[PDB]
Symmetry: C4
Subunit: 387 residues, 4 copies
């Protein structure tokens, strides 16, 4: 029983397995999947990302070498720099995601066996309807992004068909669009890992609340409590320490990809609206281009949202536990042994909090999204008014 992953979190692992983002071996168990590191998939991931980055660099160099008048996507001087910056930031995100995948997956195996212990202690997990909805949402995001990628690729390939270099665009941007797909899969993988962790934290909060109600190794019954509240509070304190450790492991594993993703999102939310506005004020003459630019703006916003939303939900659960603990304290006999257990839990809550701080650069939550959007508007207002 190496890891025994399952649910919607295990669905993106299979999807990420073919993108180089989860070099694991999946052994069916008719209930879950026993995942372990495979060296063959690690080597495949390494060679795939290396080939994709090499092809992306070669296409970026070739499109520069085609020229300004001959090339369709990058037909200016700032256009060449903006296109190169977009291509390179996407390539760097994909390379960070795939080259760091096997170590990330070992860390995943560790905190996932920890989560298996916690889930055995708490008792079961969410219903199959919730995981089906989560799988549907992940598949919807992936398919929407893939459809956008295919549409944009076909549009730019058909635009160069007038010049006759239709296959040149394919050769120069196939790796770029593959790296886009890889980046999206990496974002979704992190988001669903964080969402499964937040589900565990929600179960912990429910168990603590049931300890509060005191209706009166399978700590929970379904709710109902199968142990005295004093024992339950200590077991839940240990479980919360385990959950904090798992959250820290996830943050350590995804900190560099998360920071690169945030930087890429800032860059794209600056550049895409800029040229979308530039195409509008000067002369449209292209409905498909404007549609694609709006869709890409929404795509970058959705990328930022799927990065920062599970962290916000985790922090919200970490505040709900404090509210529950305060209501716990106001109840129970004053000088009883339950009160001292709740005091230990209070010290735990004050000392450590379950949050995400990728690389220590910032905190992943809603205020970060406000700061990024405030900076994007500041840059856009400065840049647009110059033209």
């Amino acid at each position: 029983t190496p890891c025994l992953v399952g649910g919607a979190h295990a669905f993106i692992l299979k999807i990420s397995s073919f993108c180089g983002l989860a070099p694991l071996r999946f052994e069916p168990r008719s209930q879950e999947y026993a995942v372990t590191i495979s060296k063959g998939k690690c080597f495949y991931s390494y060679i795939l990302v290396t080939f994709l980055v090499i092809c992306t660099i070669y296409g970026l160099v070739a499109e520069i070498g085609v020229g300004v008048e001959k090339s369709v996507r990058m037909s200016s001087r700032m256009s060449q720099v903006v296109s190169a910056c977009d291509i390179l930031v996407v390539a760097v995100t994909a390379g960070v995601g795939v080259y760091g995948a096997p170590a990330r997956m070992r860390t995943m195996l560790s905190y996932m066996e920890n989560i298996v212990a916690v889930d055995r202690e708490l008792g079961r997990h969410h219903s199959a309807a919730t995981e089906r909805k989560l799988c549907a949402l992940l598949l919807l995001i992936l398919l929407s992004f893939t459809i956008l990628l295919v549409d944009d690729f076909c549009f730019y390939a058909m635009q160069a068909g007038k010049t006759g270099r239709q296959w040149e665009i394919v050769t120069n941007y196939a790796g770029f669009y593959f790296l886009w797909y890889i980046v999206m899969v990496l974002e979704l993988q992190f988001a669903f890992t964080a969402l499964s962790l937040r589900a565990r934290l929600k179960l912990f909060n429910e168990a603590l609340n049931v300890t509060a109600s005191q209706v009166c190794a399978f700590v929970m019954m379904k709710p109902c409590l199968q142990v005295p509240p004093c024992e339950a509070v200590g077991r839940l304190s240990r479980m919360r320490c385990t959950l904090c450790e798992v959250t820290r492991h996830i943050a350590d594993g995804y900190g560099l990809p998360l920071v690169i993703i945030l930087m890429s999102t800032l860059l794209h939310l600056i550049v895409t609206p800029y040229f979308l506005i530039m195409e509008i004020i000067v002369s449209t003459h292209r409905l498909h281009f404007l549609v694609l630019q709006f869709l890409w703006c929404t795509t970058h916003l959705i990328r930022m949202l799927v990065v920062v939303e599970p962290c916000h939900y985790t922090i919200r659960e970490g505040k709900r536990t404090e509210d529950i603990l305060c209501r716990l304290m106001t109840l129970a006999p004053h000088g009883g042994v339950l009160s001292s257990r709740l005091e230990v839990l209070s010290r735990l809550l004050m000392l450590q909090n379950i949050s995400y701080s990728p690389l220590g650069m910032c905190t992943l939550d809603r205020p970060l999204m406000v700061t990024v959007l405030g900076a994007v508007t500041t840059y856009l207002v400065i840049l647009i008014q110059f033209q």
Copy 2:
């Protein structure tokens, strides 16, 4: 006895009832009002806001279709975009306020029965003079805003009278001004809900201070304490947990309207001073327009103030309770049972604080107003100097 609301908070509920912002049934009790959800008022609110938004969109489209030279309000290219942005942000604020009203009102019924329990425990509320002053202030704000709306509508209708399209302006902006009224009523409703909660918190602080003095279900006497301080401190700890729950419920109910209101306030505090300055530097030729622009700048500032002031007062009360608790700790016998109750209260104060964080985006307080005004000036200085 469903809810039994009363005071100045219940005055805006009747006013909001006709705007679609409080679909409740009011049953008189000669002392308070027993409010409950009515499906007929919910349907009326839905159809009213839908009709108003449809009319607003139709008028915005028609004014665009009139043209640049023919239309009076939006007679440029950036003017059409600025006018559309203002109209759409007002419509979105009103739609968020009215479409989310019935759920907001159910949450209101819940935390209001909780507040009724708390007020029975503490004992009575503020005098009738205070609620009369609050009603006077709310009515003053509402009537000032309505007078400004009517004046602005009449001014822009008379401006188009020279061209002959006086009724066109009416048809294209009636729904816009109705949505302005709805937005103001929603802001006032939130402000007075928060103010009533802050009044309850002030009563709690007074009770805790009376426990400190120890002059020696009607916990308070008037002040005087009718129970031993040890019992009073535990009852007050429970009451403070209830007040925190009620504050969180209010924040959850109003988070989306509050965020949309703040965004609209930022947009308006950017655009209104910009065109007010533009009219001044180039050529005035219009005293009424400049008067209306200054009045609208003050109106947007007052909107931000009525949003962020009750939250600041609530946070100030939440700090006063900490000061009172510290002075409590320094008194009382050192190893007594009162000291341990005060320690539990200290843990409660450290773990949770009574504040407002709409949607988790930010914190509603004075520093947020400073940040918004700092961003507005940064945008204005950049934009004005370009011209």
Copy 3:
């Protein structure tokens, strides 16, 4: 024995008494001063500030009415607005300082009798050398500012002597320079109130440290401790609550003047360097003007420094007390009664901190000065490069 103020804090009270900033009656006691509110000085302050503001407004209107070519100080279009903004912000600062003085002085009497109790408990205060140095520093700042005001007034009066309107400049700027003097005196008064409070906090920290050492109503001996450490820690906890109350009273009394002072400092640190640079790049032709502009830039920086430095020192003392308390905890018998007193003191330190937050807008400390200077440079770089 109404208040019994003394030291360098009582020196600025006499100076502020003639500026309308301290309408108190000073009764000598050969050791300190028994200060109390006098209605005659309150009326004198009111009429003086009203007359000064009326004269300032009249001079500002007259200088506008003189014209652009005829007037020397404001000889442009932006110059008239910048001059008016400077004059009006100085007038508003002086009006807030003087109109709010009597209530501020009643609050001062309250927390000063509290401080007298604390100082009797701790034992004496700092030596006469320290208060002499503080008086020398305050007098140096006041005399430097007065010399700058007189020099600037004489320079601008002599500049208009060529046109012949030498007395017009006097008539139009006498009240302006008087209000400058009043603003400086108000800043110094707040700074020395905060400095005396920080001295009391430093004495408290020394007493706590002496409790730590345990060398073994005159709690302190000089150091030495005259009471058992358990009693001393409780008395010091009460004293720290009193000091927190006094700090909050000072912040409440000076919050509006402090916020207006910070806004005026931001405005002046924007406008003075702007025109100093503008005079340099275009054509100097005036050494005295550039010298005065540099001196005014340094003056505004010194204003910000004297506002934010005593608050920083107070916060530094509030951190030193936490360090001392931690070292206290690591010592003493583990389960003794002293440990529980130190635990109560720890709860006090965690719950409340001695700082300054004027009006709740911000926190007065070094980071605020960094934020203000960062905004000033951002505005200056944007504005200067446009020219």
Copy 4:
């Protein structure tokens, strides 16, 4: 036994001794170095920095007096100001570093004898491989910076060889490059002091974790614990107070140099990329200049990194100790004496944290680097688009 310093921290002390940044006497002990203040080295440092600053000022004045067309480095009007600003900020950094060195070294002796006590208590330190790697890294940074300085000096001396004033560039920039070397040595000295402190904190965390495991004056065995966990926790609480004191001493000693270094880094990260881009867009004609500009951009980034990275590692250790303490609390008998010791340690952790706040202006960590880089990009985008 005055101080007994050793390791990679003692290597930069000898290097800084000849730069005026560590006026100490080194007495060999075959295991460590007994360092003490020497007045001769203090006087040498003072005269050396005074001579270097005098020569730097004279060269800056002479290069201005050469002219615009004749001078090669500063051949414009903004170039003269930018060059003067760079030279003066480097000179100010070097002067702050060297003039404040002897007091900094006395503080170093104090907290270093404290660290010797702590290291005797914990037991030994890291292996010789780690200190050899640290010495290699410091030497690599120093030699890379020296090679860049020599290359840049030779390039600018050879550029003036065409005009014939080859020795004029030497005379005008020798002191400038010497001050650059001094600034780099000061940065490395602070970085390695902070790194040695973080190593001590890591040893403390390991000891606390071993107390957790309870395998069962040489508190640690190697791991293993030679004392009961209750005694070990109290000794570790005292050690953590000592480490906090040492961190505060280091921050006090280096606060002014750190703030000046951060300001210089901001200025250089603004100006160097600006002129690097300006040389690119207009006309390159100079590969060596662009190579040097890119190398200087990377150098300034590395300066910021070596300033802010050891502080980030220290804060990371200070969070790891909280995680370890929480896991400690969840274990151990509930009402035992070990639990109360852990509670005292929790109060210590909550009250004080091991971090760096130079002068109180800001906090040295990763978010500060993000804020600086965000401001640099904002200034660069505004400035570049103007041209």
